[PDB]
């Protein structure tokens, strides 16, 4: 009753693609049907109350099975769910319905949710980004390049005032943003109200001395919603332009509320993806990051960490580029090479800045600019704070490298091919960049 190979999905249906690794011997159509049932009705055996309902309507149906290229032990199951199975404007409900129970199904060795098609009629019920890329650029007055940020380290042990000192020195050197670590909420060594006040002083001081708008992603991730909103309110009260939330660990209910609050109060929202690798790393069991990307765009954020792309080998980058498109673009066509199983239309829902972070330094700049283009935030932690002349100098080196790569790009140069030359030429006018290049040059013995 759940395997319906003649079913043509409606344009309003939510669709899911599950990669199923069945127990050897289990019939593919039976497994697909079982996953459709558990993720909609939960059961195969009819009880009398079922007969009170329109059973043909209110069920998921598996409508297509495909081989997984390269993996004979698995198959893709495509399942369609009527739009009415779900609470409107609720990523929480869609997620709970799709993934609440089925991952424990004992007749499969593993289940992986690869993609979910959110129909436009459902997308229109969700708040989405508080601002999105283009509004954020207008509010911050920043055009024509990627934005630059830095996470303050160490993550532990700094007072509010010392933390603010680090923030101030980074911002004055040319970074647009600094960032709270995901684990910085309110700790004995640095209580949140003190952090917010000293960070805002740092931000204002650096802004005055550079004449460029600055911000610092103040983490409002908190034990309860009351605390989260109190911290968000205080950021607004003191004039902070941007806050941060850990959407998976704080959770989707909290995130969606906070994003609505940010939209209502003009505050930008940076989203950290802490814990994603618990869920998204195993290729045979869990939820692919591209699904978590769609969920965040609907729940809402103005920036989202996406991975750096450059940290993977050249043949392994396509999926990352796919979810970056899902995050930023209005319409993303099906493309199996990039792991996009369904066309995804966002309509007019704005895109979200892709944030590249993790182990990057000035020598990655040409590739980062080429791969991400302008609507990205490039975060440099060790690559700013580790500059031998300190944070302002570190920031300035990254800023010069970025601007030199963008200018070269705009001139029509192949900036990856000519990256060393572009950086070297810029370093002739920037002592800070010249020594940064020395600091992070890969030494080969």
């Amino acid at each position: 009753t759940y395997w319906m190979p003649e079913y043509t999905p409606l344009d309003s249906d939510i669709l899911a693609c599950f990669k199923i690794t069945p127990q050897p011997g289990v019939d593919r159509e039976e497994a697909a049907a079982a996953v459709a049932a558990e993720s909609s009705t939960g059961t195969w055996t009819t009880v009398w109350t079922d007969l009170l309902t329109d059973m043909d309507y209110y069920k998921g149906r598996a409508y297509r099975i495909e081989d997984v290229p390269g993996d004979d032990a698995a198959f893709y199951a495509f399942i369609a769910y009527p739009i009415d199975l779900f609470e409107e404007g609720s990523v929480v409900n869609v997620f709970t319905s799709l993934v609440g129970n089925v991952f424990g199904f004992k007749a499969v060795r593993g289940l992986r949710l690869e993609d979910v098609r959110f129909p436009l009629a459902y997308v229109k019920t969700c708040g989405g980004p508080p601002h999105g890329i283009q509004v954020e650029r207008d509010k911050m007055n920043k055009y024509g390049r990627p934005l630059l940020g830095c996470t303050i380290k160490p993550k532990l042990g700094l007072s509010a005032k010392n933390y603010g000192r680090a923030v101030y020195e980074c911002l004055r050197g040319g970074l647009d943003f600094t960032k709270d670590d995901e684990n910085i909420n309110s700790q004995p060594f640095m209580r949140w109200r003190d952090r917010f006040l000293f960070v805002q002083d740092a931000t204002e001081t650096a802004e005055a001395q550079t004449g460029e708008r600055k911000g610092h992603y103040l983490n409002v991730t908190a034990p309860t919603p009351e605390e989260m909103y109190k911290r968000a309110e205080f950021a607004k009260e003191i004039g902070a332009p941007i806050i941060m939330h850990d959407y998976i660990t704080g959770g989707f209910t909290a995130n969606t509320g906070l994003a609505k609050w940010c939209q209502d109060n003009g505050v930008l929202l940076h989203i950290h993806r802490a814990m994603h690798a618990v869920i998204d790393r195993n290729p045979n069991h869990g939820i692919h990051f591209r699904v978590l990307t769609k969920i965040l765009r609907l729940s809402g954020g103005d920036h989202l960490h996406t991975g750096t792309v450059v940290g993977k080998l050249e043949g392994d980058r396509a999926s990352t580029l796919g979810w970056i498109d899902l995050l930023r673009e209005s319409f993303i066509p099906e493309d199996r090479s990039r792991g996009i199983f369904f066309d995804q239309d966002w309509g007019s829902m704005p895109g979200v800045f892709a944030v590249a972070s993790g182990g990057i330094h000035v020598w990655h700049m040409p590739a980062l600019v080429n791969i991400f283009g302008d609507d990205s935030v490039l975060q440099f932690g060790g690559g700013t704070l580790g500059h031998p002349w300190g944070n302002a100098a570190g920031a300035a080196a990254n800023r010069v490298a970025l601007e030199a790569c963008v200018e070269a790009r705009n001139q029509g140069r192949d900036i990856e091919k000519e990256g060393k030359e572009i950086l070297t030429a810029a370093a002739q006018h920037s002592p800070e960049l010249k020594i940064a290049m020395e600091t992070w040059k890969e030494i080969k013995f």
């Binding site: 055009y143 460029e212 010069v400």
Partner: protein, 108 residues
């Protein structure tokens, strides 16, 4: 051997590079045009550089394919407002954004 970082006011994109000569400015105009963006010129008093709304010089140069005419207008705007900061922008109608924006003369 540590060198102290010298603080000064900045002016957004490209302001961490040396100021552009004619050749470098022309290359940016040609880029903007190749992207289908409409060049525009703005100016403002130095103290008001952070304003969201600068004075527009004439109107945006819609359909303009001639790089030299845009550069000539930049120079003409400078002549009209010799103490002002002068910015080149390029309007992207599909994004409702600016594809490019930078300060050509930093003001005085």
């Amino acid at each position: 051997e540590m060198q102290d970082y010298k603080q000064s006011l900045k002016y957004e994109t490209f302001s961490y590079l040396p100021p552009m000569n004619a050749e470098r400015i022309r290359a940016q105009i040609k880029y903007a045009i190749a992207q289908g963006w409409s060049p525009g010129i703005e100016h403002v008093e130095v103290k008001n550089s952070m304003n969201q709304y600068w004075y527009m010089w004439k109107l945006p140069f819609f359909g303009e394919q001639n790089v030299d005419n845009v550069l000539a207008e930049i120079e003409a705007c400078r002549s009209a407002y010799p103490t002002h900061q002068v910015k080149l922008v390029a309007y992207d109608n599909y994004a409702q954004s600016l594809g490019l924006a930078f300060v050509v003369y930093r003001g005085n």
